[PDB]
């Protein structure tokens, strides 16, 4: 297989009339399609159920974007049988053939990108550029993993020779596993977590987040059109604590690929460590969990550059990112100039229905709204509220960009992942204290430093203990291939997505010697 | 760092007068030192305790080979503080400096090889060649990991560039972890499990098996002379279910590197999945557990070659190997010719005090003797005893090479790891059935096939589901670098020792972007 | 597949008592088996015929060394059906599996080397070292081509990428072909010409020389034990102009691999250019034919070194080599010193029964004896006989080392391949004239220069137009891998044996594009 060198899919900014025209038409068609029903996908066919999952428009939750079928234990069992049956032959496909299947799926996704973006806008309340970034990242995962998988092809292992013998070590896929995905990047992360394992010969049962079942179905439309053999990928929208837990705990699930909250990841990792009755392997579980990500700014920084990057990092997709800047750590000399600039920029942010392409759409659900507002109440008794802190008028789940300042490093709002548009500002003496405060959380996902001082940047390179660190730029939007993505500590197991290493997680090695 | 390409340390065969003289001299020096007491080693110093561990000569268990200190919770805490303190600076050593330290340790070990072999002979009842193989493998782990670690050096990760930015991804070590080691390869595996993590910047608390505390201490003498900084490696002989479990469950233990029984491995993996109170990471646990390994012989094989390889594989070190052939699966045409030859060879094997270089020494302990004899009793109810099956005369734990025939594939003796000199012979119809029987255990560590038929060998390459497979040769004695070692299924987590991939298990990745 | 880097099989010199003992034992075993009959080998089985081929001991031609079956048209058809049937599946074996099969065959051959050497001694009258070189070269071809074939494995071709497409180019084998082999290296060349095409997925019908049918059969015993699938290699001893020509001209023969006389090579190449009735391809024919090889010596040479190298090159295996020095071209200053030394050395050469390890055995047959004696008669009319030129006493075909001087460059004995122990000495003015005389034959296989003058050596490198050129050493005994072997002009098609390029001759390329 010879293809062009990997390049990232450009993210559409909708500055041209052509782009606007295409997006308007895509939004119109998706809107006109509200109420559509999407079945499960098991063993190469769409399979309906009596019960259903309902997906609302968070900008106008009286509106049903669509419904899907709902997978319970029986459907989980059918999916397991289909996946294991498929594994038997899928594992034996030449890698070139599997990689070509991924490239076909990428081409099909690229041709439907405006539709998928529009679906994100309505289903999870992304503005237009956030939706475009999500779909572009999904395409990137497919393109990248298709190529990366070839690096593991038979027989890939470097071994020491021995006289009179052939010694051959090679990788093989694990089997059938479950992918359990979040609602905040329900095209990108859903796609990446499925196609990585599948590329190298595993089969997958995919459980999309409840709030993002429709766009998950559309991804499966693409898989089906691409022509993955029956059973290779299966789509099981359903309740996480029910069908998700059922699969995690199952003796016949070989691996678990999970991205989501720490609370859930902890349960999954613990369950994975247990030998279910009749289980005949040690389960592999990859859990990529939340963060409490900080940007440090010192007195040497470009304060205007810093303020812009902080606002993008804190409020992009309403702060609903594992990578979002939820802490702003300012040295004494940076405090007033940066805070004033951040407040001025943040107070100008628009909030409204995602279809209008505002700066911020709504948060994803009534439950998310309730949690963010609850943390705002907690914050009022911990730090000083200096911007926002209110639900805005409207049926949609609109929350104003919020800033607390003089926040104690150990305050709940400085330690716990809020996952909404709520920034906590922490005042410290100097760069050394900034790093101490940055590191003193249970998490270790993303971080940033704005500084012109070389020694501070290189110090942070060595000691700001996060998996994805950025200097003099935003801390969100890690690009596949460019920035291997994944954290330390309670931000998860450090499975680095969009990196060569990711696929190794879904392989085991055999060593075969023949003495002639 | 530029050193010669890796080569395996030659295994001494003692065919020369000089080698035999050197061994006798070593045996004498070692037995003259039977009175010795070896403290713990914590934070760069030998530290004694009130209580002690006693080590016996399994060939003459009324003879004490040495005593050691005994680590409890306080000593585990002292070792943790030392290991975390050391980690802070050890992680920052240039890789070249750490690799040189390993190379020094290897040179020191090589200079002490006869002493270590003699210690194995007396402490765990290895004959001369088994002892030499064990020490040589230890040297190999050090030489191999020293070189392999340089492949991960700053900044090792291949990433896609982005305009106007430096993107730099690199590996960092995890922290302080615990190594919990078996008695059966108490120089080789003890050494490998310690020096792999340490090479790339981790620090280690090492817990040797109770039955092999003296030789473990001698390995630490080598580490100390080599000059590992205080706290980098720590020696904590003690009781597995006490100090071992304490460290496994500890919130401040970052990883666990375990080799031992499935029973214990299951507990360790389960415990590792739990978040201990105050723990701030997802623990990594590598558990490399037992096997129920088969050799298949078909009617096209060289039956004499097969019989020799089977006897070596089944009875080397009294069958006390995770890799030992405990099942012999014979197609109908191979059955009588191979069984007759195996019996003729096995009946000629000598059993006695290990220092006399018999074919078999004793099993390692009264507990092991009890276990093996109990399985012989079970086997008498399940199959037909045709050779051995008896304790032999003397205080030493001498057990005769044992063969059961007419063993049902689902019999306890055909499924459960006996870990003694007991071979179960299973008759099957053809090669397909041989593979079915081979695969139908909870394990997947080693296997072999004797056959001249190319299609049978290549079929086994694809479908005999074991981590280490060998054709027309013994299934034991995997060489570092040549045969990455580790299994599938309940044989553990497939951490492939003596392979480039091993060191990756003890690293995490950071990605750092600077926008200029 | 990972094996040790290629090394040449050492050529036994028999300087030790053990080697001499082993040879005597082999000679005894072989002569005890002189009564044996060897069938054809077709479709994985030995198949006999009514008629037979008889093989004689050229050192005692009243002594039969063995008999074989005799292939005619019906047997050629049976072999074709078997080879095409096998090709259908053999082409689809992974390259690693085919290469392992070769490696097995090499191991089996190495274990039988003394037996094969002894068979060469008795069947074709090689002395001990000539026999050992021949078998060692055979082993080398198998070891080298096994490794070289992996360099062509799917998908091996370097292509330029194109947007939105996968472009994949890869090699496939041609089909079933015929190998037609000479008697002078009937283990080495017979083996190389078969296993090269077979390695990369072709199937072969092998036609050994009439004078070397027994040793060819022994090579097939090795192939059979190695377990090549039925039809992959087939053994058809028979008459060249009958069954050989039949296969060459056949519409269903895909390629011809020939080594032999120019006379026969010309007929084969011509026939291969024709479209037989119903043929559906352009046949590939590789024809590696004779030489009229010269050594040039100038007045700057080490004359003793030159004389030794000339005598080795001219008289090794009785001059019955395509590489043998049959011309000695001496500049005026070199003439007397070199000729005197060549004569002194040549007159001391022993001639007798090959089993006694004389310097020269007999020529291979009554026909060869007739040819060589006839050329001696021609030479007496063209040049001056100064040594030998006589049949020696005994039934065996013993001919004395022969030297003609004052030979005109255009003389028949200076132009035509004699293929016996006959050296023609030509006096020239200077090095320029030496090169002119060297180049002025229809051939271009091997050549040599003895000279200390750098400018003369480098001039010859550029202008002595032979495929295999050697400076200050013998011109025979090209080693696999070290010296790609094959000539220019009427020495054949320049198929370079023991070189990476050789296998390409037996492959065609497919290019497959998928637009996504
Ligand atoms: N580290 C990363 O790369 C990354 C990326 C995106 C989001 N996240 C994290 O995800 C969280 C937001 O996503 P979310 O609200 O969907 O998370 P969530 O944990 O509530 O749910 C994630 C998925 O797990 C399922 N689930 C819920 N309970 C389960 C159970 N007990 N067993 C099995 N599955 C169960 C859900 O149905 C959903 O499919 C945030 O904490 C965010 O930081 C992390
Ligand atoms: N897969 C491999 O590479 C491999 C290699 C060698 C041995 N083994 C296996 O090891 C076993 C024999 O070794 P063993 O008898 O020393 O095994 P074991 O499981 O009894 O003990 C191994 C180590 O764990 C410690 N231990 C015991 N209980 C513990 C607990 N609950 N928590 C923490 N540590 C505990 C012991 O003290 C010892 O140091 C066999 O099953 C054999 O197959 C496997
Ligand atoms: N270039 C080289 O690598 C090389 C190597 C060895 C020998 N040779 C040459 O081989 C010759 C000696 O070998 P030989 O006497 O066996 O050669 P040859 O040409 O007489 O016979 C070679 C093979 O071709 C067969 N044959 C004869 N006539 C045929 C026909 N018309 N159609 C098809 N096959 C036919 C023979 O039976 C034999 O198997 C010398 O000329 C020597 O230089 C060349
Ligand atoms: Na929704
Ligand atoms: Na002991
Ligand atoms: Na002959």
The two structure tokens encoding residue C230? 């039925």
Please answer whether residues C184 and C261 qualify as being in contact, where contact means their C-beta atoms are separated by less than 8 angstroms: no
Render the burial of C39-58: b for 16+ CB within 10 Å, e for the rest. Answer: bbbbbbeebebeeebebbbb
Does the annotation place B510 within a ligand binding site?
A: no
3-state SS, residue A187: coil
3-state SS, residue B442: coil
Distance CA A191, CA A179 (A): 10
H or E segment and range at residue A294: strand A293-297
Sheet architecture: strand order including A203-207 = A45-47, A40-42, A233-235, A203-207, A176-180, A255-259, A284-288
- Residues paired with residue B207 on neighbouring β-strands, in sequence order: B180
Distance of CA B180 from the midpoint of ligand 2 (Å): 8
Residue B258's alpha-carbon distances to B192, B211, B273, B357, C434, in angstroms, are 11, 16, 15, 30, 76
Q: Is A68 exposed, middle or buried (0-12, 13-18, 19+ CB in 10 A)?
A: buried
Q: Is C406 exposed, middle or buried (0-12, 13-18, 19+ CB in 10 A)?
A: middle
Quick one: how far is CA B193 from the chain centroid? 9
H or E segment and range at residue C401: none
SS3 per-residue string spanning A203-255: EEEEECCHHHHHHHHHHHHHHHHHCCCCCCEEECCCCHHHHHHHHHCCCCCCE
The two structure tokens encoding residue C277? 């009735």
Catalytic entry in B288, B299, B355, B369: B288
Distance CA A152, CA A418 (A): 39
Phi-psi region of B266 (alpha: psi -120 to 50; beta: other; left: phi over 0): alpha
Please answer whether residues B102 and B146 qualify as being in contact, where contact means their C-beta atoms are separated by less than 8 angstroms: yes
A&B contacts, CB < 8 Å: 185
SS3 per-residue string spanning B332-348: HHHHHHHHHHHHHHHCC
Flag if A457 and B162 touch (Cβ within 8 Å).
Answer: no
Of A186, A217, A238, nearest to A53 (Cα)?
A238
Residue with tokens 């666990």: B256
Residue with tokens 């020494």: B361
Quick one: how far is CA B331 from the chain centroid? 31
- Residues paired with residue A179 on neighbouring β-strands, in sequence order: A206, A257
Distance CA B319, CA B311 (A): 10
Q: Which residues of A are less than 8 Å from C4 in CB distance?
A: 161-163
Q: Among B469, B480, B511, whose Cβ lies nearest the Cβ of A510?
A: B469
CA angle A407, A409, A413 (to 5 degrees): 60
**Antiparallel, parallel or unpaired: β A384-387 and A402-405:** antiparallel
Q: To the nearest 10°, the Cα dihedral for B94, B97, B102, B104?
A: 180
DSSP state of C499: S
Sequence-ordered list of residues with C-beta below 8 angstroms from that of C294, at least 6 positions apart, any chain: C325, C326, C327, C328, C329, C426, C437, C438, C447, C448
Question: In B462-506, which ranges are E strands?
Answer: 468-471
Radius of gyration of chain A (CA): 23
Stated in angstroms to one decimal place, the resolution of this structure is 1.6
Written as one string, the DSSP assignment of B206-260 is: EE--GGGHHHHHHHHHHHHHHTPPTTSEEE----IIIIIHHHHH-TT--EEEEES
Question: Start-end ranges of CATH 3.40.309.10 in chain A?
Answer: 290-479
Return the percent helix, strand and coil in chain B, to nearest 5.
Answer: 40, 20, 35
Q: From the CA of A269, how many Å to the nearest CA of chain B? A: 6
Q: To the nearest 10°, the Cα dihedral for C225, C228, C233, C238?
A: 20
Residue with tokens 């998908």: C155
Q: Where are the alpha helices (DSSP H) in C33-164?
A: 73-90, 95-111, 113-124, 128-150
Sequence-ordered list of residues with C-beta below 8 angstroms from that of A381, at least 6 positions apart, any chain: none
Distance CA A311, CA A349 (A): 9
Distance CA A23, CA A130 (A): 13
* End-to-end Cα, chain C, rounded Å: 33
Of A191, A220, A3, A197, nearest to A91 (Cα)?
A197
Flag if B455 and C101 touch (Cβ within 8 Å).
Answer: no
| Torsion sign across C-alpha atoms B267, B268, B273, B279 | positive
* End-to-end Cα, chain B, rounded Å: 33
Please answer whether residues A294 and A313 qualify as being in contact, where contact means their C-beta atoms are separated by less than 8 angstroms: no
Distance of CA A132 from the midpoint of ligand 1 (Å): 22
Distance CA C474, CA C311 (A): 9
The two structure tokens encoding residue B226? 């080599």
Peptide bond into C155 cis (omega under 30): yes
Distance of CA A259 from the midpoint of ligand 1 (Å): 5
Task: Please work out whether the CB of residue C250 comes within 6 Å of at least one atom of ligand 3.
Answer: no
Return the percent helix, strand and coil in chain C, to nearest 5.
Answer: 40, 20, 35
Of B449, B185, B429, nearest to B322 (Cα)?
B185
Ligand 1 atom 6: residue of nearest CA: A322
- Residues paired with residue C206 on neighbouring β-strands, in sequence order: C179, C235
CATH topology of domain C290-479: Aldehyde Dehydrogenase; Chain A, domain 2 (3.40.309)
Peptide bond into C58 cis (omega under 30): no
Distance CA A286, CA A486 (A): 11
Tell me how crowded residue C274 is: count the other CB atoms within 10 A of its CB: 11
SS3 per-residue string spanning C265-281: HHHHHHHHCCCCCCCCC
Indicate the class that CATH gives domain B1-289+480-516: alpha beta
Distance CA C207, CA C220 (A): 12
The two structure tokens encoding residue B256? 């666990």
Of C21, C3, C4, nearest to C12 (Cα)?
C21
Residue with tokens 């290493």: A501
**Antiparallel, parallel or unpaired: β C45-47 and C40-42:** antiparallel
The two structure tokens encoding residue C485? 């072997």
DSSP state of A399: B
DSSP state of C241: I
* End-to-end Cα, chain A, rounded Å: 33
Of B248, B246, B236, nearest to B82 (Cα)?
B236
The two structure tokens encoding residue A459? 């110090």
Of B181, C434, C247, B275, nearest to A263 (Cα)?
B275
Sequence-ordered list of residues with C-beta below 8 angstroms from that of C394, at least 6 positions apart, any chain: C352
The two structure tokens encoding residue A71? 């997978």
Task: Please work out whether the CB of residue B189 comes within 6 Å of at least one atom of ligand 2.
Answer: yes
Q: How many residues does chain B have?
A: 516
Please answer whether residues B172 and B201 qualify as being in contact, where contact means their C-beta atoms are separated by less than 8 angstroms: yes
Residue A440's alpha-carbon distances to A288, A327, B202, in angstroms, are 19, 12, 22
Q: Among C97, C100, C227, whose Cβ lies nearest the Cβ of B453?
A: C227
Q: To the nearest 10°, the Cα dihedral for C492, C494, C498, C501?
A: -150
Residue with tokens 């070896």: B38
Question: Start-end ranges of CATH 3.40.605.10 in chain C?
Answer: 1-289+480-516
Sheet architecture: strand order including B60-69 = B37-38, B60-69, B52-57
Distance CA A420, CA C193 (A): 74
Catalytic entry in C123, C288, C299, C369: C288
Quick one: how far is CA A20 from the chain centroid? 26
CA angle B91, B258, A501 (to 5 degrees): 55
Flag if B472 and A274 touch (Cβ within 8 Å).
Answer: no
DSSP state of A361: -
Distance CA B259, CA B385 (A): 32
DSSP state of C42: E
Helix axes C113-124, C95-111, angle to 10 degrees: 70
Catalogue the active-site residues of A: 288
Task: Please work out whether the CB of residue B149 comes within 6 Å of at least one atom of ligand 2.
Answer: no
Q: Among A4, A163, A516, whose Cβ lies nearest the Cβ of C103?
A: A516
Of A180, A176, A193, nearest to A71 (Cα)?
A180
Distance CA B287, CA B289 (A): 6
Longest dimension (CA), chain C: 79
Distance CA B466, CA B293 (A): 9
Please answer whether residues B427 and B406 qualify as being in contact, where contact means their C-beta atoms are separated by less than 8 angstroms: yes
Residue A328's alpha-carbon distances to A381, A427, A455, B167, in angstroms, are 19, 8, 20, 23
Peptide bond into A128 cis (omega under 30): no
Q: How many residues does chain C have?
A: 516
Distance CA B470, CA B310 (A): 12
The two structure tokens encoding residue B379? 């086997």
Flag if B454 and C225 touch (Cβ within 8 Å).
Answer: no
Flag if A5 and C163 touch (Cβ within 8 Å).
Answer: no
Of C202, C209, C208, nearest to C220 (Cα)?
C208
Tell me how crowded residue A33 is: count the other CB atoms within 10 A of its CB: 15
DSSP state of B436: H
Residue A36's alpha-carbon distances to A55, B360, C269, in angstroms, are 10, 73, 72
Please answer whether residues A113 and A105 qualify as being in contact, where contact means their C-beta atoms are separated by less than 8 angstroms: no
Q: From the CA of B454, how many Å to the nearest CA of chain C? A: 6
């Amino acid at each position: 297989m010879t293809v062009e060198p990997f390049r990232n899919e450009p993210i559409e900014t909708f500055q041209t009339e052509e782009a606007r025209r295409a997006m308007r038409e895509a939004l119109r068609r998706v809107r006109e399609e509200f109420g559509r029903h999407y079945p499960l996908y098991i063993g190469g066919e769409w399979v309906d159920t009596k019960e259903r999952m309902v997906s609302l428009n968070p900008s106008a939750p009286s509106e049903v974007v669509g419904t899907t079928a709902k997978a319970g234990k029986a459907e989980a069992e059918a999916a397991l049988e289909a996946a294991w049956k498929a594994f038997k032959t899928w594992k034996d496909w030449p890698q070139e053939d599997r990689s070509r299947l991924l490239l076909k799926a990428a081409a099909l996704m690229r041709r439907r990108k405006r539709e998928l973006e529009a679906t994100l806008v309505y289903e999870v309340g992304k503005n237009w550029v956030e939706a475009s970034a999500d779909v572009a990242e999904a395409i990137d995962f497919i393109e990248y993993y298709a190529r990366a998988a070839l690096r593991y092809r038979y027989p890939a292992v470097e071994v020491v020779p021995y006289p009179g013998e052939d010694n051959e070590s090679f990788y093989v896929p694990l089997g059938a596993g479950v992918v359990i995905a979040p609602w905040n990047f329900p095209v990108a992360i859903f796609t990446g977590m499925i196609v990585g394992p599948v590329a190298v010969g595993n089969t997958v049962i995919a459980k999309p987040a409840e709030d993002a079942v429709v766009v998950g179905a559309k991804v499966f439309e693409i898989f089906h059109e691409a022509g993955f053999p029956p059973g290779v990928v299966n789509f099981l929208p359903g309740v996480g604590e029910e069908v998700g837990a059922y699969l995690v705990e199952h003796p016949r699930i070989r691996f678990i690929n999970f991205t989501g909250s720490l609370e859930v990841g902890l349960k999954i990792y613990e369950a994975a460590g247990r030998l279910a009755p009749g289980q005949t392997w040690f389960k592999r579980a990859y859990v990529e969990t939340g963060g409490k990500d900080a940007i440090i700014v010192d007195e040497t920084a470009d304060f205007d550059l810093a303020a812009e990057g902080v606002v993008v990092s804190a409020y992009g997709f309403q702060g609903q990112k594992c990578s979002a800047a939820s802490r702003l750590i300012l040295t004494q000399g940076a405090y007033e100039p940066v805070l004033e600039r951040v407040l001025k920029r943040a107070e100008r942010l628009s909030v409204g229905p995602a279809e209008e392409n505002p700066d911020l759409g709504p948060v994803v659900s009534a439950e998310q709204e309730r949690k963010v507002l609850s943390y705002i109440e907690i914050g009022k008794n911990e730090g000083q509220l200096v911007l926002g802190g209110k639900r805005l008028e409207g049926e949609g789940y609109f929350i104003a960009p919020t800033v607390f300042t003089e926040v104690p490093p150990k305050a709940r709002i400085a330690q716990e992942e809020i996952f909404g548009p709520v920034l906590s500002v922490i005042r410290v003496k100097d760069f050394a204290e900034a790093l101490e405060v940055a590191n003193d959380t249970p998490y270790g996902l993303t971080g940033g430093v704005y500084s012109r001082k070389r020694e501070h940047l290189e110090w942070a390179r060595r000691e700001f203990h996060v998996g994805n660190l950025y200097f003099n730029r935003k801390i969100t939007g890690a690009l596949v291939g460019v920035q291997p993505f994944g954290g330390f500590k309670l931000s998860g197991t450090n499975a680095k997505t969009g990196a060569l290493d990711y696929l190794r997680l879904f392989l085991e090695m055999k060593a075969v010697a023949e003495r002639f």
